[PDB]
Amino acid sequence: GQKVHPNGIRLGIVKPWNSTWFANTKEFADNLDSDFKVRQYLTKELAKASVSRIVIERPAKSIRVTIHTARPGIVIGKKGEDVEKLRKVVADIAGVPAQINIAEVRKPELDAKLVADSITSQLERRVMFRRAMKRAVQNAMRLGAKGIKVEVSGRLGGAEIARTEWYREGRVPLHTLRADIDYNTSEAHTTYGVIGVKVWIFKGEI
Amino acid sequence: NQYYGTGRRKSSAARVFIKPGNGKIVINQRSLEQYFGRETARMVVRQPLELVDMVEKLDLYITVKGGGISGQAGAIRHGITRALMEYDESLRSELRKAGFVTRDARQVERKKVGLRKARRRPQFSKR
Amino acid sequence: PRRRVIGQRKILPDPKFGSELLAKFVNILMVDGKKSTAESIVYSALETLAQRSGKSELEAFEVALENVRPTVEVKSRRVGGSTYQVPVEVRPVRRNALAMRWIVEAARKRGDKSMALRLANELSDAAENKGTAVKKREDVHRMAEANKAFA
Amino acid sequence: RSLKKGPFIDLHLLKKVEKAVESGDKKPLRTWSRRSTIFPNMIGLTIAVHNGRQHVPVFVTDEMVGHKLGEFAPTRTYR
Amino acid sequence: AKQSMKAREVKRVALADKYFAKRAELKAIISDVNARWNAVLKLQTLPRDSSPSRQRNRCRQTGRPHGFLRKFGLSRIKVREAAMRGEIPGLKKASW
Amino acid sequence: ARIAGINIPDHKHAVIALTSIYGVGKTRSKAILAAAGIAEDVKISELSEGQIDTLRDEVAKFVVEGDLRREISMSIKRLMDLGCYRGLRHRRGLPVRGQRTKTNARTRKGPRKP
Amino acid sequence: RIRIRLKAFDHRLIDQATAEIVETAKRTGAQVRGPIPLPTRKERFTVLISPHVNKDARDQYEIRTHLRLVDIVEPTEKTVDALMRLDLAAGVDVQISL
RNA sequence: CCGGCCGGGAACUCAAAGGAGACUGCCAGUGAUAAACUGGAGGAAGGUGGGGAUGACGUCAAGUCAUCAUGGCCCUUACGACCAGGGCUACACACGUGCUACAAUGGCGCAUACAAAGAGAAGCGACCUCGCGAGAGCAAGCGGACCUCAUAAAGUGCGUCGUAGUCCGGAUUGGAGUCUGCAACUCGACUCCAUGAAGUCGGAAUCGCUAGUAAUCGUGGAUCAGAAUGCCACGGUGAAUAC
């Protein structure tokens, strides 16, 4: 087990943080756990909506949750009853007056959360993994994407030993720190157990 | 008139002020033999002033803080050689040649994880 | 030393006599990074050495150290599958480095009161070359003299 | 040792000792409370102290008083 | 880590701020150089889990007792996971 | 120099030759020489006889040699006759004050047997 | 007189915010000293990186809190009216204590 | 009021943001006129300047089902749950990693100088009074370049000790206590008085370190009500040697 998380080593360099509140030591743990609850809830209740990121920020006793998603229409719905329902329950969880926004992730096959969730969904619909991976690399390289690597792992095809079998195309410069590597990871709970899907997407060199 | 040098050495900082005058040295409102001149190597604040001599040449009011004994002393040496812009760039030929204008940038190396100190690895048993 | 040929770092000379030789002698004597203590011992011991021998300071030191410098020393080879102790000519910096290491080590062996008396008596016993460091030099020279047959 | 202010006994052991000296020393006492400093009124009683598995009877002599209960009930059996 | 233990932890906190910080008053004020009666040293028949020295500071997410970090409120494992994803603001790798 | 018993110390500073008395260390010795009005660094040679029995008169006010040895012995016997933890522990010859006997109980337990 | 002390985790974000509060204040009121920087607090955390044994593998982390101090001198009513409700900063803690 | 103490000054240390800087860039020589190497100047730094982060494809069916998640199996009036006491601290032994030592380059007493990095509200807790001391009482200031922790210690200058198991060493043990905590018996930490082992430089063997390094000296922090000789950091002094 030996590679650094390629989001974490780029946190001040190119990648931003998904939480951008300041807090002293008295409420740092409380704000942090409140963020675990709103991302847990808001991740479970938008499983069909293809959600990429949820960014929390707290401007002066009020949360401001931004849902980067690929299907904004299914998040908002017929006149946005679903949004006001979500800020009602996020205001229930965080205990502050909640705002909520939706940012449309166009080009959803270049986002690693959406790619890993895609391949994970296909693996738990019992399709063969080489199609899922290989299709994901092809259609991601089709639109921009100066590199992509996907990597499934663990008891693939229902075996009794676990393999990995990664694929990559293009250039994925993972030790370069100015590389805009969009990396994310999902787990596929199949009837044989968990299958881990990692995906790195190299977008640009700065 | 009044001639300045910044002069630092391993976590020290020696402001060196020079006026022309006698051969006295005033460090933190204290003489040289009373600041650290009861201790090891007070010669090194006097080394820049033996390249051309200080006999009755210039009074220097110096003010050092941070560091230890030797750190403060090396800081004053570098401070005087930075403060010998009193005379022009003449001195900084020979003063370069003694190795005095070099900021000695040796600092204490950080302690690293799994090592007791900066490089002393903890001893390893049988094989 | 596998690849890297090296330079060497320049030591500050002695603050009383301007002698880098004696500065390396107070570094050989120093323990636990305590240099003030070691230079106090060297100034006391060589001061009573200059008072006893009546010569001067560092020429009494230079005579007492001139009697303990090795000429040639043995050295292992392991070339032909055998252990040879070949004699080899000592470099001058290594020569007086070994001189000082033997004086200091033999002075730590002695049974007098203070370190300045142990080392003042060891340098005085080396001035008429009858001490312990001269027995170390004669021992080295018996090893390199017995095994002269390898050059 | 401990405590500039008061010694320590449990209140249930206080009440069992008061009733034990009032109505006479009749039976050994089930005490789990090893935390408890022997008082001078406890002299003569047989207080069984729990050692993890067994209540072992402790007859209180006069010089038990500056001590905890559990000193007289060893917990580990070494042979 | 064993649901029971997390429930036990919530019991100890709830008793800790019911009784004590209100009757821990006793141990701060009456056990003192004032008179004395043995009484308030015996008025620690409070339910023993009102004592705040019986909370463990488990991890907020997994209830792990060891490796806790009071700043983040999490064990070292969830601190690293969340730190790398980017949910802990300001926190990044350090090197000096 | 025969103070507090058969103890005869001499040719040594008075703060330190008094430490030969079983039951006075450095502190109690500073207390004896301060209470008897004696300088701390005089020897017993170069010290008068009236001065010596002022030291006898001062050392008599603390529990020393015989009374202290039988007081200590009495304390240990009380513990071993109680049969408390400190007495069973004191009796078997194993460390009393809650120390480690898995290894490194070796003053109390003596040099290792097989 | 009126010290406004700003704290944030991002130095670009805090010097943007304090540049805005400086030009706001000395635009409306008068006599602003300047963004004095006041040492960064580096809090370091050294976690074990493995879920079991392996002490020697650790990960070191830090949170850098940046301060800035402004210290507005003139108590104009215009600068305290215009100074309120105008921050547009999200990760800044301000202290507007007199 | 001799203290940056005040008015004041923004030079300087410094703080933190933004830039410049080091690239074989220049020179000489050697080299396929190539890569480069050796040496020189300038420069704070010279040749990946120092240190860190960064750990390729894979190996060990290496470690973790006890952080978590999880397939299957299994218990489901019990292998689940609540409680008190105990244990994880046991001790003929053996091994690992450390600390303290065996001393005079030192021990002790008196005076006196020079740090860096940190932490702090159910917290850090001055001053002053009491206690030999650990501490106690009243209690300012500080959510903190402002206050507190907090005196750096080795160093230096005097005096003493005088080669003794000693003024070394502090284990062990008795007594008396302080604090935290419902509660120090099993089973804390610290203090005071007393005790004063083993140990005089370590067999075979073995380990770390190439320069602010080893060695040695202190300080801080996390966990934590209280409990470090460990861990993670910080600075002080500061080597030897590399054919």
Side-chain angles (χ1 to χ4, degrees), chain B residues 67-117:
Chain B
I69 298 302
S70 179
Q72 286 181 348
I76 295 154
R77 180 168 62 69
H78 186 207
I80 296 167
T81 59
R82 289 286 292 276
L84 292 177
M85 66 160 317
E86 182 270 331
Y87 293 155
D88 55 349
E89 298 286 331
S90 179
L91 289 177
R92 284 185 48 190
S93 297
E94 290 87 358
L95 202 56
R96 177 90 196 175
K97 185 135 57 79
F100 290 172
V101 305
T102 306
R103 164 66 171 83
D104 192 3
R106 294 184 285 174
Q107 299 220 337
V108 292
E109 183 179 359
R110 70 178 284 273
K111 177 201 186 285
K112 297 163 190 181
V113 69
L115 279 61
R116 282 197 295 108
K117 55 201 285 251

Side-chain angles (χ1 to χ4, degrees), chain G residues 3 5 7 11-12 14-15 36-44 46 49-56 58-60 66-69 95:
Chain G
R3 302 178 171 281
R5 197 169 72 200
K7 292 165 88 184
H11 66 276
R12 301 185 284 177
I14 196 169
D15 68 1
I36 302 155
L38 288 182
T40 293
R41 181 71 89 166
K42 291 170 189 167
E43 303 217 342
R44 294 185 168 88
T46 306
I49 197 184
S50 172
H52 201 62
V53 60
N54 297 123
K55 60 152 187 290
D56 282 328
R58 300 193 193 187
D59 204 349
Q60 284 161 357
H66 306 287
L67 284 85
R68 289 298 174 269
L69 185 137
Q95 286 175 347

Side-chain angles (χ1 to χ4, degrees), chain F residues 12-13 16 19 21-28 62 68 72 75-76 78-79 85-86 89-90 92 94-103 106-109 112-114:
Chain F
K12 193 180 290 212
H13 292 278
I16 289 155
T19 65
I21 289 93
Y22 181 97
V24 43
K26 191 172 180 204
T27 307
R28 186 67 185 86
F62 193 77
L68 188 61
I72 291 166
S75 301
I76 296 169
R78 179 194 78 213
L79 296 166
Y85 184 77
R86 186 189 306 113
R89 186 61 60 171
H90 223 291
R92 196 173 176 84
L94 284 186
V96 166
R97 302 145 123 79
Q99 301 156 6
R100 190 161 198 286
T101 66
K102 181 172 192 180
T103 43
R106 196 57 56 196
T107 291
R108 191 58 169 117
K109 190 172 151 175
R112 55 178 52 76
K113 289 168 191 175

Side-chain angles (χ1 to χ4, degrees), chain A residues 34-76:
Chain A
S34 173
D35 296 347
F36 291 109
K37 297 292 209 184
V38 304
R39 296 167 195 271
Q40 183 177 32
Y41 181 74
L42 202 59
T43 297
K44 182 183 176 157
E45 293 294 329
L46 292 176
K48 301 152 203 285
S50 297
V51 57
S52 168
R53 293 168 69 244
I54 28 189
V55 171
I56 311 295
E57 64 186 2
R58 300 187 184 196
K61 300 287 288 209
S62 179
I63 205 170
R64 181 69 63 82
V65 188
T66 300
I67 299 166
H68 292 279
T69 188
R71 290 191 206 168
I74 199 195
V75 179
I76 297 170

Side-chain angles (χ1 to χ4, degrees), chain C residues 54-103:
Chain C
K55 292 175 62 66
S56 170
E57 197 83 13
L58 62 85
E59 71 180 0
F61 176 67
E62 195 274 334
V63 160
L65 183 139
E66 188 163 13
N67 286 317
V68 302
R69 285 172 183 157
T71 309
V72 290
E73 67 178 1
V74 296
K75 182 159 180 316
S76 179
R77 285 302 304 144
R78 301 288 295 158
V79 179
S82 292
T83 298
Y84 285 169
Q85 292 295 101
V86 301
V88 70
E89 288 76 10
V90 60
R91 314 295 297 161
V93 181
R94 182 178 170 74
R95 189 189 295 274
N96 54 12
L98 287 171
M100 294 176 182
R101 190 183 297 152
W102 295 339
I103 286 164

